């Protein structure tokens, strides 16, 4: 009974299942007969068999060694001759296909990747009307296929019908109708207003088949000599060849639905009846029949969703088309016998196409794996960009707006806040996609005024419900039966109206049917602003998993499903007992007697260097049931999502530490290990083979002390369990290199005498600056071990380092209601305000920011959490709760607080004059504050923006090759850019020497840099600058364009002419090295 | 053009990097050589005109790609970069390398709120300060507390001896610093302060200067610059010090 929310990851699984079941078989059957140019020897593919091979590596092994999770495809073949007999048949290997993980992702080159869904136009026919600057209403029609060339029809201001093929000039429709082989009698039988076409016939003249073909050739191919057979060939290759034109099932279905035809579903090419019906519809629309309508292109009934299987089919098509030409060329060129089918197939283009699609495409994306919510959200995204979609620069403005047809199908809140805002969306919670590519939503039917809540809800599409009166999900019923009230709001013909409770047709299932998963986890959301809801949804996906997570006291009811539908919770499948529990293994024995075993992940790494860990919940000998949780992941409590913690909060100002959205916290949050997280990083090294000689991984590192080799072992690899700081040696690598930078006399004398020594260089692997932690895993891969190393390499080493991080000053914290801040101070617990119980507070927030940001749901949440903690109740509330009353939330909170006060027996926990306020004392002096303040329990999170990954400084480093300016980037010791706005500010101030020193000495004056550095070191004055390098580069670039540009010196006296100055010459006899150095 | 402005680059292990000017120059040279060879052996004068046309098109593509006819396309369907594309637009030479630049002796970090400060003071973390003031510290280590040479001072700094902090505490006394926030809409977006060393990894800012910068303490970051010469220090002290900006120029 009732309604159960279905799986949230059904799109990807359904798409891949459809691909495997039908797409490959249908695709392999569209090119099976391959012929040579002249005669016999046809090649055939039996595509229905298509066997698959078991993968060689599992998911964990593939991720360990940076591999790919894939299978191999084998398809039987056959080569006949029919002239001398001797049929041949064997099995052909066509390539390898990546496999889908049961979580719905792909493993490519050791990385998790996702494929997003695309929103595109639907194939079919569309009509439009437009007005000129002088009136003169005009009509157009456009026919769009799944793949091929479009068709266009237009009406003129005089009453003439024109045809525009692809991108050619206008054409009379008579030539196109006659070239198809239609007489005037059959043309007049399909037009309902034949006197309208007479004008076109008269003003454009009559044509025969051959004359029409000649005219078609003339206009389509200007310059070439016309020919009847030629024009016939263009027509056939344009609109009738089933290799360059495709309608699709959806296209044929839409054409039949719109134009009212009954053509069979197996025809996927244009016919004459379709063109005649389109012209008839255009004519009838012009003459205002009243039963013909124009089309809206933003309507969700005219748009389609494309998923992974449909996108893979096209790449398979391109690869097979590329392979077929090679097959034919090899079949014709060779003139020998024993041409085996296995020797006629070159599976290079297919493999290349599949690899390019899965590795370097726009819709294949690096998956977001900060926490389970982000991973779940990434899989349900809809994108309007990509091949066949739109472009950021060429996108208009109607595509970034909200349409009335989006309700219940696309969330109107979750969207990016950057340059691509309004172009990427999220699927709604209750939405689903049918077998044509359109989105449906469910409703309940009503009869005479009673909601039938036990009658198998009806799924409807955007165009099906345009002619019915549909009510929202907040309509209140007496006993789940009759609709109360006398004026019910409804939607009719894409308009909000009101009607009596007897003309209603359907009702939505839930009040939260309009939003997405992330937005559905915010309680008391109807008391906030929409922008703050968007910010809260965005910030909920940036939380870090904690050491010991906690589920919220005040929830919404969707946490268990969100935790379950992402794939880290293990549940008992039978009704038995527990036989064996261990930190890495759980066994379940049922009542019958069979056993089930599970292994658990332990301290693994995610895409964003977070932690994935599983722990048991049950004990030995416990009695379990079906569906009970026995283990959980890193960011989940016992079956529920848990991202933050519940802490004590008061709303009042401190001594300036809450000034502008800053946060003051206590020291208990540090030494009690609250908000402490674990991070894991990976380092890699390889041993190549240079032309001079192979490099070696060894321990004998030239010119290094003994204290730098304590932790290495035999080979020269760090030991597991060691503590490393910056500069430590992880893997010792030495390169045999013969650099020539010394006088050859000593080298030749040593070579002749002998005494072979170390002529090598040291470039070993060291940990970067600002890193420390424990070594937890070392993996070594070599040859002679069945390992697939990159070409030109002999050994690969991987090291894993783990770290624990606590909260500190400069870290970002946030809640679920759009409130964010930065920690500015940590206080000892004897200095914080305390309660009449004597308990110090945990965090102090400024009230000034509550009414300015217009997010007052946090006060409701805190006041409910206070009572929840005092009662041990853990309430759950559904949004839009005012349909049962007028002050539902306030009354609920007040009742809970009064009940808690009565139960605990402490009269100070609730007050009647100030319902939400308590008295608070000062921990420094012991004096109470003037007025009571607001105290509660808040659910807070810690984000991934930590100050440890943001501090950077530079004095001198690398420079660019061309412009000789400092490099840019944190990862390569880069400098900060001084843009033109800062130059404007410095010019407005009047400081000229600062600007001049910034522009020349500190950026690219190759000689002045060293002079300045050495003058500073020696304590003398800084000499005057010269000319920057970029000006000389610009002068050379301008001269390369054959322009005579030069600098001149004015003539002081006499008739002597001005003299050209050589800028690229040395003035002073001093050295100019590439980088500043300390001389002596 | 000189060869050092179009470098070849020796990454890729065994292959080489791609530069677009070299391809156009090679095409021009190839067409010229073919035309000369054809002209030498007295070819029929219907094949020579073809080579002349292709040479003209190649030179046109080298000068300005896509100005007249079709555009030359590299490996992927991506047009090449000609000589006129280097000096043309927002990413050209003029607006990227001449009117703005990257600089040395600069830093960047997150900002927190510091009360109990003076309006002309700021708080600088020690990790940033030890890097931004290196030559002055080296000079003071050589002059006072006679060490020996530069190498010993660098070894002392790297080893993190406690003396370098005592030296740095008095190197920075009296030396102004410049602070900037990313959108500089008017001249009050850059200002000069006097630094004091703090423990941590965030910069402390006086609450009374926030509205001029348009900054709040919920995620913003700031950039720090250090003057070098005596004239620059005098200008920073007497023209841009944050305690002398009382009224609005607008």
């Amino acid at each position: 009974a009732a309604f159960h929310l279905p799986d949230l990851v059904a799109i990807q699984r359904n798409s891949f299942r459809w691909f495997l079941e039908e797409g490959l078989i249908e695709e392999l059957e569209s090119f099976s007969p391959i012929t040579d140019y002249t005669g016999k020897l046809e090649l055939h593919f039996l595509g229905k068999q298509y066997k698959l091979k078991r993968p060689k590596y599992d998911v964990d092994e593939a991720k360990r060694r940076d591999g790919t999770y894939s299978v191999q495809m084998y398809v039987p073949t056959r080569l006949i001759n029919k002239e001398t007999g001797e049929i041949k048949e064997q099995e052909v290997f066509i390539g390898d296909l990546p496999l889908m993980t049961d979580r719905g992702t792909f493993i490519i080159n050791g990385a998790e990747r996702v494929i997003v869904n695309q929103i595109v136009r639907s194939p079919g026919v569309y009509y439009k009307s437009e007005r000129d600057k002088n009136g003169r209403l005009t009509h157009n029609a456009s026919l769009i296929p799944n793949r091929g060339a479009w068709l266009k029809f237009e009406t003129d201001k005089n009453g003439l019908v024109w045809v525009r093929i692809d991108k050619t000039r206008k054409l009379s429709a008579q030539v196109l109708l006659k070239a198809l082989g239609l007489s005037d009698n059959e043309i007049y039988d399909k037009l309902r207003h034949p006197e309208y076409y007479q004008k076109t016939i008269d003003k454009e003249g009559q044509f025969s088949e051959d004359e029409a073909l000649m005219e078609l050739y003339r206009k389509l191919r200007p310059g070439e000599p016309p020919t009847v057979s030629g024009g016939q060939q263009l027509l056939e290759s344009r609109f009738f060849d089933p290799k360059r034109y495709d309608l699709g099932r959806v296209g044929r279905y839409k054409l039949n639905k719109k134009l009212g035809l009954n053509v069979a579903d197996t025809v996927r090419t244009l016919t004459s009846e379709d063109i005649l019906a389109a012209i008839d519809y255009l004519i009838n629309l012009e003459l205002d029949l009243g039963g013909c309508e124009v089309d809206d292109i933003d309507h969700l009934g005219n748009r389609r969703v494309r998923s992974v299987g449909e996108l893979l089919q096209n790449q398979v098509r391109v690869g097979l088309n590329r392979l077929e030409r090679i097959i034919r060329e090899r079949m014709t060129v060779s003139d020998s016998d024993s041409l085996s089918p296995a020797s006629l197939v070159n599976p290079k283009p297919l493999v290349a196409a599949i690899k390019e699609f899965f590795g370097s495409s726009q819709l294949s994306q690096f998956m977001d794996q900060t926490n389970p919510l982000a991973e779940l959200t990434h899989k349900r995204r809809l994108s309007a960009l990509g091949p066949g979609g739109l472009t950021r620069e060429r996108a208009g403005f109607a595509v970034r707006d909200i349409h009335p047809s989006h309700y219940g199908r696309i969330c109107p809140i979750e969207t990016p806040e950057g340059p691509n805002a309004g172009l990427i969306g999220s699927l709604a919670t209750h939405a689903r996609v049918n077998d044509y590519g359109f989105i449906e939503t469910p409703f309940w039917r009503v009869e005479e005024g009673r909601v039938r809540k036990d009658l198998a809800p009806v799924y409807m599409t955007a165009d099906q419900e345009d002619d019915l009166r549909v009510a929202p999900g907040d309509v209140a019923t007496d006993d789940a039966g009759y609709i109360l009230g006398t004026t019910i709001p409804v939607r009719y013909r894409q308009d909000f109206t009101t009607t009596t409770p007897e003309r209603v047709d359907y009702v939505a299932l839930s009040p939260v049917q309009i939003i997405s998963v992330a937005t559905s986890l915010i309680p008391f959301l109807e008391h906030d602003d929409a922008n703050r809801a968007l910010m809260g949804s965005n910030m909920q996906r940036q939380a870090v998993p904690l050491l010991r997570p906690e589920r919220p006291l005040v929830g919404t009811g969707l946490e268990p499903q969100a935790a379950r539908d992402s794939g880290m919770v293990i549940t008992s499948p039978v009704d038995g007992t527990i036989s064996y529990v261990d930190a890495t293994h759980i066994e379940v024995t049922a009542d019958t007697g069979e056993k089930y075993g599970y292994a658990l992940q332990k301290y693994q790494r995610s895409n964003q260097d977070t932690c994935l860990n599983q722990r048991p919940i049950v004990f030995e000998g416990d009695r379990v049931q079906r569906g009970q949780v026995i283990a959980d992941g890193s960011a989940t409590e016992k079956g529920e999502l848990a991202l933050g913690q519940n802490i004590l909060v008061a709303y009042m100002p401190w001594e300036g530490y809450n000034y502008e959205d800053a946060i003051l916290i206590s020291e208990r949050l540090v030494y009690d290990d609250v908000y402490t997280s674990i991070h894991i990083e990976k380092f890699e090294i390889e041993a190549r083979q240079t032309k001079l000689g192979p490099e070696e991984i060894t321990r004998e590192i030239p010119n290094v002390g003994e204290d730098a080799l304590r932790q290495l072992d035999e080979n020269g690899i760090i030991r597991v369990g060691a503590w490393v700081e910056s500069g430590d040696i992880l893997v010792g690598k030495v390169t045999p290199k013969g650099e020539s930078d010394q006088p050859p006399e000593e080298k030749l004398l040593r070579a002749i005498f002998g005494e072979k020594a170390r002529d090598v260089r040291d470039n070993s692997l060291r940990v970067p600056n600002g890193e420390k932690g424990r070594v937890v895993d070392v993996r070594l891969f070599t040859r002679e071990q069945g390992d697939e190393l990159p070409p030109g390499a002999n050994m690969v080493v991987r090291v894993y380092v783990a770290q624990k991080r606590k909260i500190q000053v400069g870290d970002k914290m946030a809640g679920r209601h759009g409130n964010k801040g930065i920690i500015s101070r940590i206080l000892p617990c004897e200095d914080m305000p305390y309660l009449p119980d004597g308990t110090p507070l945990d965090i102090v927030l400024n009230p000034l920011g509550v009414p300015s940001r217009m997010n007052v749901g946090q006060v409701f949440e805190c006041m409910l959490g206070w009572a929840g903690q005092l009662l041990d109740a853990r309430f759950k509330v559904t949004p839009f709760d005012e349909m049962y009353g007028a002050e539902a939330s306030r009354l609920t909170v007040n009742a809970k607080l009064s009940e808690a006060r009565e139960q605990t027996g402490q009269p100070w926990v609730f007050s009647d004059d100030e319902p939400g306020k308590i008295q608070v004392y000062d921990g420094r002096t012991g004096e109470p504050f003037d007025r009571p303040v607001t105290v509660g329990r808040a659910y807070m999170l810690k984000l991934v923006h930590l100050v440890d990954d943001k501090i950077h400084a530079r004095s001198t480093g690398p420079y660019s090759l061309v412009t000789q300016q400092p490099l840019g980037g944190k990862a390569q010791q880069g400098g900060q850019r001084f843009g033109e706005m800062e130059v404007w500010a410095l010019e407005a101030y009047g400081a000229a020497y600062i600007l001049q020193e910034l522009l020349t000495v500190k950026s690219d004056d190759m000689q002045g840099r060293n002079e300045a550095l050495n003058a500073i070191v020696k304590g003398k004055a800084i000499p005057r600058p010269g000319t920057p390098e970029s000006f000389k580069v610009l002068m050379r670039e301008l001269q390369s364009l054959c322009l005579d540009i030069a600098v001149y010196k004015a003539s002081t006296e006499d008739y002597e002419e001005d003299k050209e100055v050589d800028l690229m010459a040395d003035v002073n006899q001093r050295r100019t090295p590439s980088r500043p150095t300390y001389e002596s | 053009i000189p060869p050092d402005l179009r470098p070849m680059v020796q990454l890729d292990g065994g292959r080489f990097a791609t530069s677009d000017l070299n391809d156009l120059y090679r095409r021009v040279i190839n067409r010229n050589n073919r035309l000369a060879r054809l002209q030498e052996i007295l070819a029929p004068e219907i094949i020579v005109r073809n080579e002349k046309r292709m040479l003209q098109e190649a030179v046109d593509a080298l000068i300005d790609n896509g100005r007249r006819g079709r555009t030359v396309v590299g490996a992927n369907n991506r047009p090449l970069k000609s000589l006129s594309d280097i000096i043309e637009g927002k990413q050209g030479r003029f607006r990227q390398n001449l009117l703005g630049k990257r600089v040395d002796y600069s830093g960047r970090s997150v900002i927190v709120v510091g009360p109990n400060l003076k309006i002309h003071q700021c708080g600088l973390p020690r990790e940033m300060a030890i890097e931004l003031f290196q030559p002055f510290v080296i000079h003071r280590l050589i002059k006072n507390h006679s060490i020996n040479n530069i190498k010993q001072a660098k070894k002392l700094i790297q080893k993190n001896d406690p003396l370098i902090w005592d030296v740095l505490e008095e190197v920075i006394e009296g030396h102004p610093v410049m602070l900037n926030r990313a959108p500089t809409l008017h001249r009050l977006g850059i200002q000069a302060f006097e630094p004091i060393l703090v423990e941590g990894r965030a910069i402390q800012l006086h609450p009374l200067v926030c509205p001029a910068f348009n900054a709040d303490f919920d995620g913003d970051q700031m950039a720090v610059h250090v003057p070098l010469s005596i004239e620059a220090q005098a200008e920073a002290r007497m023209l841009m010090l944050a305690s002398g900006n009382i009224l609005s120029p607008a």
Binding site: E987, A992, L999, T1000, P1028 | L98, L99
Partner: peptide, 16 residues
């Protein structure tokens, strides 16, 4: 123009 070639701007302290 003095910015592009790297000279003292004719305004402020670089007036003369």
């Amino acid at each position: 123009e003095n910015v592009i070639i790297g000279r003292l701007i004719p305004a402020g302290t670089g007036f003369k």
